[PDB]
Amino acid sequence: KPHRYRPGTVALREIRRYQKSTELLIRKLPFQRLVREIAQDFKTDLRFQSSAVMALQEACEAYLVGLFEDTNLCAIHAKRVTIMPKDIQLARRIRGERA
Amino acid sequence: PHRYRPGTVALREIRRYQKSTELLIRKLPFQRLVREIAQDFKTDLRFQSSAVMALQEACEAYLVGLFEDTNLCAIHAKRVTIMPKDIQLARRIRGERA
Amino acid sequence: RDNIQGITKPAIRRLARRGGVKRISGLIYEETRGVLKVFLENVIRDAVTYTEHAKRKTVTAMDVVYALKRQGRTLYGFGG
Amino acid sequence: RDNIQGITKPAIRRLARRGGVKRISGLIYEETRGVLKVFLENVIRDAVTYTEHAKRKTVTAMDVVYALKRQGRTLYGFGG
Amino acid sequence: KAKTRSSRAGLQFPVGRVHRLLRKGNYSERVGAGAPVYLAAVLEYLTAEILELAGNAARDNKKTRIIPRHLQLAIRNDEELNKLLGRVTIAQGGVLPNIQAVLLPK
Amino acid sequence: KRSRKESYSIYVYKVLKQVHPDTGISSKAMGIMNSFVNDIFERIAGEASRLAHYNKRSTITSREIQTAVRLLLPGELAKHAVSEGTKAVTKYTSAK
Amino acid sequence: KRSRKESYSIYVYKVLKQVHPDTGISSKAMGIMNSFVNDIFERIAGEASRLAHYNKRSTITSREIQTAVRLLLPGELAKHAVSEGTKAVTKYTSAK
DNA sequence: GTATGAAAAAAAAAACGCATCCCGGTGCCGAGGCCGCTCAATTGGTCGTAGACAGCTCTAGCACCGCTTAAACGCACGTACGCGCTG
Ligand SMILES: [Ca+2]
Ligand SMILES: [Ca+2]
Ligand SMILES: [Ca+2]
Ligand SMILES: [K+]
């Protein structure tokens, strides 16, 4: 027969799941290609220690995770539950990341 | 008798103080608050008047800043009136408080 | 009272005006005093710590300047 | 090109989940890519700048570590 | 016979002083003769950049003499100087005039 | 007979009279400018110091300064600074 | 012919076996601990360096370290650290 | 759907008044510039070593390849959240 969890019940489960864990959440290659792509702009025919790329990924994920925590609060502060661009922008504007 | 609508003056005040740079806290009450707080860390302490002035420049600047940020948080909630929870958010995001 | 009340409602209103605030909840005036205190506590503590290290009895501007730099709130026009 | 699309919707969802986000506006997935790019740009630029100063053609972990320290986003466990 | 290093480098800023400040500031064991010139220049350039803009802000206020507020206005209105002096408070600087749109009347 | 307090104020005047010969500067402003110089001096020196340290080199050369400047100043401001620096070193090595 | 890379890892083990003799530590964790030591070392040294500079003194003494530690560590952590530091210097000067 | 009048809501027009901008007008003090003293930068010579350079060694970073399966993608559905409106 049918079974269907109400909208949000899974999201919450996912939250608990990923907070419990420490594994990197972006796929390792697509990231590595994005790194080299961005590094080309500064100098071509560049090589990277695999550890160097991993460090960049640890930093990135950590940064974003953090930005989201802050964003979430901004969303909630507006009596919402759904994060939206303007929430991120506020968080960065206050963090002093942007003007 | 003549009476400006609530907010018309507030706006005028905004324009007035943004235009100017003079310190907005009364110089003595501040100086006493400095010495009062310094007692806690060590008694029979003296202060260069310049040292006190620096603390005041820093303080006002800091607060003015915190308010700008607070204001945005208030507005972000479809409000115009800043409230404690607005400040708290601003500091929580600034990483001033947990 | 002590001196923290010396930071008058109208003075806070003034600061928040320079911050471009239009309307201020009554609760804010005490909230601000508390924050202001926390600031001065953290800055002065360090300033005095510099004073003590110099074996001085007199807090210099520089003591405050050096202290604020540590707190990531650098100040221009009082030296260093 | 645009490996920035390689940063898949579901991967961003995952990150925001670890951030304790429950519901995510469609617009956010592009917004995030942009922010992420700006981050990597700023960090890598510096990393490479350290690489170039060492007259190397190979970006080391340390290059990234030193770079992040500059940006005030210190990283532990890559030889800090 | 003897001329200032500043003169040879075509600078106002004291190459000699800077070279000393570097040795006496526990920055490194030894200080290249090139270093202090270069540094002196950069400091000179930045000084000019700010003064040019402050000097403009002062002409824009019918004042002969630059005051703090001028230096602030100059810095906070130039995208790049703002970003450089992002964590700096300028004594008696005031803030840029700015009233959030939604706060204005209709 | 008071104790000589060093200051960049004479060099700020000289540079001011270049960029606006018909413009002056309040003591307070001049204060801010002195702070500004000392601040960015420490910033560049510091980053140069580390650059040397990181590369197991004992000596801070104009190379380290340049790299520091590229790291510390934003785009346009960096380009200009670097030029002025390179220009000045070039001019000094050629006047021996 | 390998690089001969120094590390605090042996001193972290020794201290670990004191505080929890029946527990060990993943290489990755040990990495983090090495980072941690180096970070706070640089922090304290740095603040000590400036302390000396600011007070026109050429020499970094245990006094400068203490002051640095009082400035850098929060309340309880500072108290403890200072004590352990004072204790350790006292113990060393008295063991000639 | 042509013509209806009755209020409701908005828009414009005409006046009462406070604030703000300009001025020209007067005095005060700090900005500005000069003078003498001094010590901090410059000079010219000696010495020690940092590091640039070439020659060599082998790390580990690149590319490639095929297999399995986990994750990405899409589409369909329907709820509950955002968001406007009201008192
Ligand atoms: Ca602008
Ligand atoms: Ca006149
Ligand atoms: Ca010579
Ligand atoms: K290699």
Residue numbers in the entry:
A (entry chain K): 37 to 135
B (entry chain O): 38 to 135
C (entry chain P), D (entry chain L): 23 to 102
E (entry chain M): 13 to 118
F (entry chain N), G (entry chain R): 30 to 125
List sentences from the manuscript:
Eukaryotic DNA is packaged by basic proteins into chromatin, which consists of repeating nucleosome units composed of a core element of ~146 base pairs (bp) wrapped around an octamer of four different core histone proteins in 123 left-handed turns. Here, we present findings from cohesive-ended dinucleosomes that self-assemble into lattices composed of fibres with uninterrupted Watson–Crick continuity of the double helix. The offset pairing of dinucleosomes in an open-ended fashion yields uninterrupted continuity of the DNA double helix from one end of the crystal to the other, making the lattice like a fabric woven of chromatin fibres that are interdigitated with one another. The chains assume open configurations, in which the DNA path zigzags to form two nucleosome columns on either side of the fibre axis, permitting dense packing of nucleosomes by virtue of the staircase-like fibre profiles that foster a key in lock style of interdigitation.
Nucleosome fibre structures for the 349 and 355 constructs were solved at up to 3.4 Å and 3.8 Å resolution, respectively, and in both cases the asymmetric unit is a single dinucleosome repeat. In spite of differing by 2 and 4 fewer bp, respectively, in the shared and paired linker DNA sections, the 349 nucleosome fibre is analogous to that of the 355 in that it has a zigzag configuration comprising two parallel nucleosome columns. Instead of the fibre axis running between the two nucleosomes of the dinucleosome repeats as occurs for 355, the 349 fibre axis runs between the repeats, which stack with one another in an offset fashion within each column. In this regard, the nearly planar 349 dinucleosomes are canted along the fibre axis at a roughly 45° angle, supporting an alternating arrangement where each dinucleosome is paired in turn with two different dinucleosomes of the opposing column. Moreover, one face of each nucleosome is stacked against the face of a neighbouring nucleosome with which it is connected DNA-wise via an intervening dinucleosome from the other column. In this way, the 349 fibre is in essence somewhat folded and is thus less extended than that of the 355, with an average rise of 30.3 Å per nucleosome. The intrafibre nucleosome face-to-face contacts of the 349 configuration involve histone-histone and histone-DNA contacts as well as divalent metal-mediated interactions. For this binding configuration, the linker histone globular domain sits at the nucleosome centre (dyad), where it interacts extensively with the outward facing minor groove in addition to making contacts with both linker DNA arms. Given the close proximity of the shared linker DNA arm in the opposing nucleosome column of the fibre, the linker histone globular domain in fact makes additional contacts with this element of the juxtaposed dinucleosome. As such, the on-dyad linker histone mediates internucleosomal, albeit intrafibre, interactions.
